[PDB]
Amino acid sequence: NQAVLKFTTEIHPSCVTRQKVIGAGEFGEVYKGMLKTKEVPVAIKTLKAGYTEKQRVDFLGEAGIMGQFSHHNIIRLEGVISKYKPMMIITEYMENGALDKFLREKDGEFSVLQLVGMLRGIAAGMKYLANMNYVHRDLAARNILVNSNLVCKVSDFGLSRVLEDDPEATYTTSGGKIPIRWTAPEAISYRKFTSASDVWSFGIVMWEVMTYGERPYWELSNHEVMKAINDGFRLPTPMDCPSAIYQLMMQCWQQERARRPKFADIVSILDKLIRAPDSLKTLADFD
Numbered sequence: 001n002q003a004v005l006k007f008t009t010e011i012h013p014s015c016v017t018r019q020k021v022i023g024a025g026e027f028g029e030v031y032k033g034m035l036k037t038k039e040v041p042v043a044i045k046t047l048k049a050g051y052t053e054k055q056r057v058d059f060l061g062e063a064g065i066m067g068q069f070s071h072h073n074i075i076r077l078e079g080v081i082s083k084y085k086p087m088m089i090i091t092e093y094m095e096n097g098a099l100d101k102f103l104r105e106k107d108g109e110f111s112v113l114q115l116v117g118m119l120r121g122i123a124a125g126m127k128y129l130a131n132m133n134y135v136h137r138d139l140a141a142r143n144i145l146v147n148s149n150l151v152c153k154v155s156d157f158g159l160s161r162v163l164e165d166d167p168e169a170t171y172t173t174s175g176g177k178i179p180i181r182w183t184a185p186e187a188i189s190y191r192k193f194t195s196a197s198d199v200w201s202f203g204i205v206m207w208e209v210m211t212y213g214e215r216p217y218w219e220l221s222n223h224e225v226m227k228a229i230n231d232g233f234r235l236p237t238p239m240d241c242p243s244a245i246y247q248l249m250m251q252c253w254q255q256e257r258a259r260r261p262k263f264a265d266i267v268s269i270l271d272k273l274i275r276a277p278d279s280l281k282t283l284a285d286f287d
């Protein structure tokens with residue numbers, strides 16, 4: 001990590017004030033705080049003393065990756081505390097939290113145009129990651145953060161730590177740990193994770209957004225989801241969903257990876273719909 005960490009600012013512990021717990025885990029927490037530079041609010045992820053070598057490499061490795069990105073729709077790294085304990089990753093603060101919880105608590109409070117604007121931001125962040133040769137593997141509303149301008153930013157970076165740390169990722173019969181109902185068939189079936197499997201996941205995120213955080217496939221078990229997808233079934237249209245948006249998410253769920261749009265296509269399509277907003281007035285039939 002010592003090369004990628006050169007892109008990161010080492011922050012002295014005195015400059016950081018932790019204030020409120022906003023997330024928790026086994027070996028650390030997530031805080032809202034302030035960062036001395038005037039003071040800016042920040043989000044802070046910690047790693048407490050007792051961590052293993054692998055945990056340190058994974059934890060600092062996320063910062064090394066995040067520090068190589070500069071994009072409006074990608075969470076911005078402020079710096080790290082790595083010389084002292086607890087270790088910390090310090091990012092910009094997203095006032096409205098995770099997108100999935102945000103939408104479930106704000107059910108029906110946004111216009112279609114605002115929801116589609118969210119999706120455009122997510123797709124722009126994903127296009128950037130893909131062209132930077134970064135495959136996310138865990139794209140889902142729970143990993144998108146929302147600020148007070150309603151800007152959505154992709155978070156949760158790293159190598160093995162991404163799917164290890166997510167409790168939605170479960171062990172398959174063949175030994176991989178994956179979040180089944182967000183994951184493309186080829187990634188489940190033979191561990192083929194690419195920007196095109198991220199597009200499948202993006203289609204699920206489109207459904208999460210337009211449903212205000214409905215849980216994909218409802219109470220179907222993971223095996224029943226895999227069986228339904230293999231047999232050709234797809235998630236049904238959300239309520240009050242523009243036909244163009246439903247058509248786009250259905251294209252993200254093509255079984256054949258080569259038939260899915262690229263993120264460049266997704267951004268282009270969403271930008272044209274937004275700039276001609278009457279295109280969103282035509283709604284797909286809700287059952």
Ligand SMILES: COc1ccccc1-n1c(-c2cc(O)ccc2C)cn2c3c(=O)[nH]c(=O)n(C)c3nc12
Nearest residue numbers: 022030043044045089091093094097143155156157
């Ligand atoms: C989905 O966001 C997280 C997931 C797990 C742990 C922390 C956060 N996480 C991050 C984050 C994300 C990273 O990938 C790396 C470092 C950090 C600090 C920022 N925020 C925020 C945030 O800025 N505002 C929030 O309300 N919440 C709930 C947050 N949760 C996180």
